[PDB]
Amino acid sequence: QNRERLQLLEE
Amino acid sequence: TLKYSEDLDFILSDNSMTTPEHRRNNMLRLCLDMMNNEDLCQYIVKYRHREVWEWCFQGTDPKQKVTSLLQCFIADKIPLLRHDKRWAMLSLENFILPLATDEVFPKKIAGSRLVKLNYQDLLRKLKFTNTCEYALYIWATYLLYTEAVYGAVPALARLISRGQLKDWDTACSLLENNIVAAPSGSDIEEYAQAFQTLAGLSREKLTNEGVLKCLIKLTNHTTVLELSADLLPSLVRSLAMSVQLHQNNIVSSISEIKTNLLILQLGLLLNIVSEATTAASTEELTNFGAVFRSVFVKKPTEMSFVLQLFLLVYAYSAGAAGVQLPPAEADFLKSELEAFATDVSSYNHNIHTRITRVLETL
């Protein structure tokens, strides 16, 4: 689902 | 039909035999027909797509603004398939990026009376009336392709900081998508530049989700933080005051906008404070003290991701400023951090890994 969970920190 | 076929033979005049004004004028007349006639568009795409495309994109020059605008409409009106190599006739680095980052667009067209009327008429119909916005749109819509574009990340950051557009979502997304995961030293210097630019924006821009994601993404490379270290306490103040402003939304929240915003500001804090112990001790971040006290006193059985993230960022602040928490406060923190570690371990190794590091001091 589309909830902000900061996966951005891993790219 | 014929009609379209003979029309096209005419309008697609040999570019090596015409002046740029005549070329421009035929392209204008083509765009305006296509804008007015979906049937002509279907015809082109079924039967003459490659010849029309090679004709439109035979020459590209970001200094010819009116032609460049027409060419952005063509790409948008009859796009080639995603992997068609003839998309390379629109050079990202030498045509699209320049157009995307230059806000100056002429308000008049040099030409006959009818040319000028035809141009006004087209402009009233185009999705965008300048190449800065059309070229951003093309780039993000059809060319999110693409190897990283050299010079894109700082040039986009400079475009945001000049502040001419009313919506940055597209600029930011293209900036974000042109940050690679294994940058060279040269990419890193570009990333440093861009980060210093975005970190220099008005405090308002620190509430813009697009900008925060760029800032998070740039700060994933710790060498960007070292090259920009003297700016970090200032960014930290801004972010810590913003979080403090919306502290009512940390424990509980019924706002998607406020929650995502706090998560992204805390994620950006985390990126800075877990790597720069000097910035972790910035005085306003230690005013997160107040909020942690609130939470500790009136315990809750339920801990949302945002509160967990707040506590992690707080543990970094406390540690760097030499805050000593009495044994109750320290054990509550250590304990909520360990539970957050068990949640995040299967989906965010970066956060887990930051929690572990911090628990060594508890």
Query: With an 8 Å Cβ cutoff, are A5 and B217 in contact?
Result: no
Contact between B3 and B47 (Cβ < 8 Å): no
Q: What technique solved it?
A: X-ray
Distance CA B228, CA B221 (A): 11
- Which residues in chain A have their CB less than 8 angstroms from residue B263's CB? 4-6
Query: With an 8 Å Cβ cutoff, are A9 and B347 in contact?
Result: no
Phi-psi sector, A2: left (phi>0), alpha (psi -120 to 50), beta: beta
From the centroid of its chain, how far is CA B4?
Answer: 41
Phi-psi sector, B3: left (phi>0), alpha (psi -120 to 50), beta: left
Query: With an 8 Å Cβ cutoff, are A8 and B270 in contact?
Result: no
What single string gives the DSSP state of each residue in B107-150? Answer: SS--S-HHHHHHHHHHHHHSS-SSHHHHHHHHHHHH-S-SS--T
From the centroid of its chain, how far is CA B349?
Answer: 24
Query: With an 8 Å Cβ cutoff, are B260 and A4 in contact?
Result: yes
Q: Which of residues 1-11 of A touch B (CB under 8 A)?
A: 3-11
H and E: helices and strands count for chain A: 0, 0
Q: How far apart are the CA of A1 and the nearest CA of chain B, in angstroms?
A: 13
Query: With an 8 Å Cβ cutoff, are A5 and B347 in contact?
Result: yes
Phi-psi sector, B322: left (phi>0), alpha (psi -120 to 50), beta: left
Report DSSP state, residue B59.
S
Residue with tokens 């568009």: B41
The encoded tokens of residue B60 equal 């590209």
Contact between B139 and B173 (Cβ < 8 Å): no
* Domains of chain B, each with CATH number or no CATH: 1-362 (1.25.10.60)
**Residue B51: C-alpha distances to residues B11, B80, B231, B342 (Å):** 12, 12, 52, 59
Distance CA B91, CA B143 (A): 10
Residues of B with CB under 8 A from a CB of A: 181, 213, 216-217, 220, 259-260, 263-264, 267, 270-271, 305, 309, 347-351
**Neighbouring residues of B172: CB distance < 8 A, sequence distance ≥ 6:** B156, B160, B208, B210, B211, B213, B214
Residue with tokens 């952005």: B72
Distance CA B362, CA B312 (A): 12
Cα separation of the two ends of chain B: 79
Distance CA B18, CA B13 (A): 7
